[PDB]
Write a protein that binds this ligand. Structure first.
Ligand SMILES: *[C@@H]1O[C@H](CO)[C@@H](O[C@@H]2O[C@H](CO)[C@@H](O[C@@H]3O[C@H](CO[C@H]4O[C@H](CO[C@H]5O[C@H](CO)[C@@H](O)[C@H](O)[C@@H]5O)[C@@H](O)[C@H](O[C@H]5O[C@H](CO)[C@@H](O)[C@H](O)[C@@H]5O)[C@@H]4O)[C@@H](O)[C@H](O[C@H]4O[C@H](CO)[C@@H](O)[C@H](O)[C@@H]4O)[C@@H]3O)[C@H](O)[C@H]2NC(C)=O)[C@H](O)[C@H]1NC(C)=O
Ligand code: NAG
Ligand code: NAG
Ligand code: NAG
Lengths: 53, 221, 214, 53
């Protein structure tokens, strides 16, 4: 990222709010699964058992 | 029925593969999963990787990330556990238990129904060494003892008078020091009324060496 | 990955008492659990699976309980084979971590330890080593701290211990506290007295040997 | 059951008309299944092949 970031308000930084999660979805063909990554805000994901999942 | 008995090599040199083999008798692991459990002295039990019967697939404890390797063959009564770069902290009683194939509450549930017999394995260099016997005696209720040092391997029987295995025979567990050669103490509790008169012959014997040594307690002043 | 902690790590009760254990998890393992009665020197024997289903053939007094995270076991009557190490095991997700291992023993015949002392014999001097041991006998319970005031300074580390199991006659133990030294250091200091700590006795009894022939 | 069951009609009992049916559900450990139970009337289940299924 850029460093100075125009720190006029200087409120904070979006780290520790988003998570870079990878998961297996299905492509246009049912018999083919692909692993894809996505950035999700921490308010959209809940933590089930096995805390690293 | 299902019976699991394992012999394997036994004691092996440090940094050498421990290729333990478990024998399945009566039944077969055509669909069940076989598991390895080792039990450290005291402490608890640590699960070792798993193997299937219909397919060749190996699980592994993440602590043993790459040290483990398993094998299965055509007949389903032979199985081998292979460990690489085996360190000096791998003394345990490697058990052999099979996962439950079916149950009221599920299928292939990995809770160990029937265990094996196992074996108490130890690893150490400078292994071969003959026992050395020392006597024990006070200077003036008291007791005596027959210490055995730098012996190998376990165990060493401690015959108190060859017939005095009745009272006060507190045969302590064997101990291992930093030198790698074991020390084993012994004692028989006797009051202060039969000292200096009756001989307390102590015929401590090691099975592979037969260290037949006779000694008695003496009071020196 | 999942750490099971079972309590109490040490408990003692007499015949026919009411004993309870707990095996708390750090993550929810549902109802998946198994209990074992692992006597030392032999393989463990399964008692409970799915945390409440009694195994077949085993005595039906192992009224297990618990669900979710707090799992507990209860025993109504105590057999002579009851007194052994217990382990709680989960099978929710890999790895299959076991428990620490609680202990159950008979709690009777409280008494005070008997302290002994044995200065090394002359033939132990023929070899370049010194074998002096302070023996502990007839004490309850297991835990005890042996002190060695070597001229008032404790050169700790050389005090080895070896405790026999629970007795079948008067329910005691036996620790072998020894400090194996050499001839170049054993003769340097003056006093080698062993002092222990206990509750059933009155004062910690000091045992030593005279400097010289004893 | 209780014994009397208010035996005024004396017709029969619901056994031999209901069944346990149980089915697999997948779990965390690979090749491990959990049985889910239910009681189904005999009029709602049919035996296709491989009896007891
Ligand atoms: C809830 O889930 C559970 C579990 O998922 C489920 O129960 C399973 O149901 C399936 C399907 O019915 C069962 O699968 C069968 O397994 C049979 C056993 O296979 C093993 O043994 C083969 C031969 O050795 C034995 O042979 C005879 C057989 O009776 C025996 O006496 C001998 O003593 C000897 O032990 C062995 O060849 C086989 O290994 C082969 O297969 C694997 C996997 O494909 C392959 O990788 C290997 O290389 C090898 O080729 C295995 O070790 C088996 O006989 C049977 O096979 C029939 O079905 C296949 C496929 O449909 C057909 O091609 C053919 O008709 C075969 O005859 C089948 O595979 C499984 O055992 C159950 N598990 C249990 C009971 O624990 C429940 O049903 C579910 N609940 C529901 C659905 O309600
Ligand atoms: C991200 O936010 C933290 C929180 O204060 C801050 O310390 C850090 O400088 C920000 N930027 C980066 C690149 O970490
Ligand atoms: C996606 O699937 C692949 C192979 O099936 C697996 O290696 C990977 O760990 C999966 N990723 C997940 C479940 O996030
Ligand atoms: C149900 O009815 C049958 C009729 O044949 C009878 O034999 C049985 O005892 C009754 N009760 C139960 C619990 O099955």
């Amino acid at each position: 990222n850029v460093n100075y970031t125009n720190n006029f308000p200087n409120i904070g930084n979006i780290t520790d709010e988003v998570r870079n999660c990878s998961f297996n979805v299905t492509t246009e063909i049912r018999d083919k699964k692909q692993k894809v990554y996505a950035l999700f805000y921490k308010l959209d994901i809940v933590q089930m058992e096995n805390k690293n999942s | 029925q299902l019976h699991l008995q394992e012999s394997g090599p036994g004691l092996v040199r440090p940094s050498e593969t421990l290729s333990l083999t478990c024998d399945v008798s009566g039944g077969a692991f055509n669909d069940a999963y076989c598991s390895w459990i080792r039990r450290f002295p005291g402490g608890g039990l640590e699960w070792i990787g798993r193997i299937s019967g219909r397919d060749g697939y190996v699980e592994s404890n993440p602590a043993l990330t790459g040290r483990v390797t398993m094998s299965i063959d055509a007949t389903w009564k032979k199985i081998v556990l292979r460990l690489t770069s085996m360190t000096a902290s791998d003394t345990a009683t490697y058990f052999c238990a099979g996962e439950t194939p079916e149950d009221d509450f599920g299928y292939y549930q990995p809770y160990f129904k029937t265990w094996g017999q196992g074996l108490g394995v130890t690893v150490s260099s400078a292994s071969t060494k003959g026992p050395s016997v020392f006597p024990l005696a006070p200077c003036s209720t008291a007791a005596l003892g027959c210490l055995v040092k730098d012996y190998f391997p376990e165990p060493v029987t401690v015959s108190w008078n060859s017939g005095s295995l009745t009272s006060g025979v507190h045969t302590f567990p064997a101990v291992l020091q930093s030198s790698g050669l074991y020390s084993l103490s012994s004692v028989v509790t006797v009051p202060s009324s039969s000292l200096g008169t009756q001989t307390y012959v102590c015929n401590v014997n090691h099975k592979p060496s037969n260290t037949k040594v006779d000694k008695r307690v003496e009071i020196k002043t | 990955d999942i750490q099971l902690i079972q309590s109490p790590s040490s408990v003692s009760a007499s015949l026919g008492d009411r004993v309870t254990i707990t095996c708390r998890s750090t993550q929810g393992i549902g109802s998946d659990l198994a209990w074992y009665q692992a006597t030392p020197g032999t393989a463990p024997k399964l008692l409970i699976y799915n945390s409440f289903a009694l195994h077949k053939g085993v005595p039906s007094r192992f009224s297990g309980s618990g669900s979710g995270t707090e799992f507990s076991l209860t025993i109504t009557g105590l057999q002579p084979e009851d007194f052994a190490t217990y382990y709680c095991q989960h099978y929710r997700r890999l790895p299959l971590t076991f428990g620490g291992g609680t202990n159950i023993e008979v709690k009777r015949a409280v008494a005070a330890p008997s302290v002994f002392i044995f200065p090394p014999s002359e033939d132990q001097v023929k070899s370049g080593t010194v074998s002096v041991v302070c023996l502990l006998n007839n004490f309850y319970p297991r835990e005890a701290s042996v002190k060695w005031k070597v001229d008032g300074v404790l050169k700790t580390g050389n005090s080895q211990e070896s405790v026999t199991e629970q007795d079948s006659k008067d329910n005691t133990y036996s620790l072998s506290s020894t400090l194996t030294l050499s001839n170049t250091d054993y003769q340097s200091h003056n006093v080698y007295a062993c002092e222990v700590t206990h509750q059933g006795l009155s004062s910690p009894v000091t045992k030593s040997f005279n400097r010289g022939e004893c």
